[PDB]
Amino acid sequence: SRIFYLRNFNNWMKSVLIGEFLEKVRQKKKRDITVLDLGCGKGGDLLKWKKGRINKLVCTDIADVSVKQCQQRYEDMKNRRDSEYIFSAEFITADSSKELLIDKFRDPQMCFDICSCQFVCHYSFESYEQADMMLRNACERLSPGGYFIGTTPNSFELIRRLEASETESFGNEIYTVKFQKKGDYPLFGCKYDFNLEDVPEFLVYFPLLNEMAKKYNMKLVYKKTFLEFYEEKIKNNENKMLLKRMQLPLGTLSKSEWEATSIYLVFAFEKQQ
Ligand SMILES: Nc1ncnc2c1ncn2[C@@H]1O[C@H](CSCC[C@H](N)C(=O)O)[C@@H](O)[C@H]1O
């Protein structure tokens, strides 16, 4: 109702992102696709992976109830009738910032063509170790040429609104951000409250994320604001009538919705050879 169109939009953003890199993986002649969905939540991306026609998915999250719900929705998905091919799936409760996923994989030798981290990475920036660990978990088992893709708040946009504010808070009808306070932005542990009409988040300084990713032999493919990404993707009609069947620019979202969503960026990294 209130944020339905915002959610819809986020789903559309993820769809097109996931879509783009599934094709890139396939154009490198990769037949059977293996994917790690890191911080999978309740399975909002299950259907995107099913229509990407991947062969194996690992869903993991720190919240077990979410993992279990993700599993049940998966069970329902291919207990549908005359349901075309579905990936095999593996479900793991774990803190991907404090625990090594390879130690919990049923198959410890397993590799991935894509790690998808959607609206997750920023939780790991509580400390250097947690950040490095989530990056490791996202990137260590990636095959060369494989991709690390995701969505996280854009720190530049967050700071800009903070410093433009009369307080340590800012927002509108839809969202509210509250810093522990402005002027002080440590690389790790920069805490702010994020309210979508409620969970603590950490600032992700992207040039820092870029450097730390190098440790795992990753090179940046691109980084784009939600706005830029939105503007580019709709010059292709497959995506736009996709968006309309799923149901600042004048543009598809109210000005307040645009303020909420324009907070985010999309990124992709590639595993080097
Ligand atoms: N340290 C951590 N390790 C793994 N998952 C975490 C985490 N901290 C938070 N999360 C999870 O990240 C999720 C963010 S909401 C994103 C859900 C899903 N990827 C989607 O796009 O719909 C939540 O499910 C939360 O439980």
Numbering used by the authors: 167 to 363, 367 to 416, 451 to 476
Publication excerpt:
Whilst high quality diffraction data (2.3 Å) was obtained, the lack of density in the lobe region indicated that the lobe was absent in the protein crystals. Thus, binding of RAM permits stabilisation of a lobe structure, RNMT 416–456. Despite the absence of the lobe in this mutant and in thermolysin-cleaved RNMT, the crystal structures are not altered significantly compared to RNMT–RAM (RMSD 0.5 Å). RAM binds distal to the RNMT active site and does not alter its crystal structure substantially when compared to the RNMT monomer or the E. cuniculi methyltransferase Ecm1 (15).
The cap intermediate is methylated by the RNA guanine N-7 methyltransferase, utilising the methyl donor, AdoMet, to create the mature cap, m7GpppN, and byproduct, AdoHcy (S-adenosyl homocysteine). In mammals, RNA guanylyltransferase and 5′-triphosphatase (RNGTT/CE) caps the nascent transcript and RNA guanine-7 methyltransferase (RNMT) methylates the cap. Human RNMT is a 476 amino acid nuclear protein consisting of a catalytic domain (residues 121–476), with homology to other eukaryotic cap methyltransferases and an N-terminal regulatory domain (residues 1–120), that mediates recruitment to transcription initiation sites. RNMT also has an activating subunit, RAM (RNMT-activating miniprotein).
